Amino acid sequence: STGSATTTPIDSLDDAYITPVQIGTPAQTLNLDFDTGSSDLWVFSSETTASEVDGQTIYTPSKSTTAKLLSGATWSISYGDGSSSSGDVYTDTVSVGGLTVTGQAVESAKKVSSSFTEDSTIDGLLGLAFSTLNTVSPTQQKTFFDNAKASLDSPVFTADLGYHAPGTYNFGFIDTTAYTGSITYTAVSTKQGFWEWTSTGYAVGSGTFKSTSIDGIADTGTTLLYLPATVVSAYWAQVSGAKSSSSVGGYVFPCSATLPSFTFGVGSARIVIPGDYIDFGPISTGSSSCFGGIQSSAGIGINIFGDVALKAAFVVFNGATTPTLGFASK
Secondary structure, three states: OOEEEEEEEOOOOOOOEEEEEEEOOOOEEEEEEEEOOOOOEEEOEOOOOHHHOOOOOOEOHHHOOOOEEEEEEEEEEEOOOOOEEEEEEEEEEEEEOOEEEEEEEEEEEEEEOHHHHHOOOOOEEEEOOOHHHOOOEOOOOOOHHHHHHHHOOOOEEEEEOOOOOOEEEEEOOOOOOOOOOOOEEEEOEOOOOOOEEEEEEEEEOOOOOEEEEEEEEEOOOOOOEEEOHHHHHHHHOOOOOOEEEOOOOEEEEEOOOOOOOEEEEEOOEEEEEOHHHHEEEEOOOOOOEEEEOEEEOOOOOOEEEOHHHHOOOEEEEEOOOOOEEEEEOO
């Protein structure tokens, strides 16, 4: 089997991407944030504290003839951005772009943090990291991809995120028309539960490539590119007037600037992030100070190849017995 679904930016800055997901019978379609940095499929629901729902579409398991309470199971998650959610668990039928999993754990939110409530466009998350990170207790549950894998034509999914435009998540096949050149594959460590890999270096604009190992995670659920302070300083030094602002919480730059590209290495291959991908707009409405899309990972504890990086590539998440990651230009 295969699946193919369009993923759409939630706003003009590509702060996140939403993908429609069918849950239950009859189908209830929710727009979920596909997150290769976590492993829970959780949704706003009829059980979510009413004051914490503001415009989201909810899953109502009592209206689904295939929903079954997973007795005794609870979940609770906290994300790197400080947001969180928790609740109980149903199993139900879940379909993404024509690919159907029966008995998928659908984690129903009883509580969500303010960041989730305030974002009307995201109805929940669909985790695509390794199932070892799944938070369901006392019986850990499998991700949608893990459940689908054996049925897929090939045990892979691909992320093709757009810049200020829709893109695609495919399951079970590689669309050879979706990228240019070749796909370069690179080793993955699953020891922390993430799609963790090592970039071979970077360049700033038309500058020379610096060969250096950068361990990080491929994370579709993180907006920005978070890299070591040395790398980030070298990038922003090429933008007149750019500075790190402790008050704002990162590097800012004059909105009048033209940003240089940023290249990262994948083995001997190179992925170029155009300068415009690194512009996240005014820090506040009407400001001439703009927020940078490349930020320091210092104090995150890990480097994160988030959407800023991934959207410059066609990315293969290869879930074979020994997982790997593939990157192509597009």
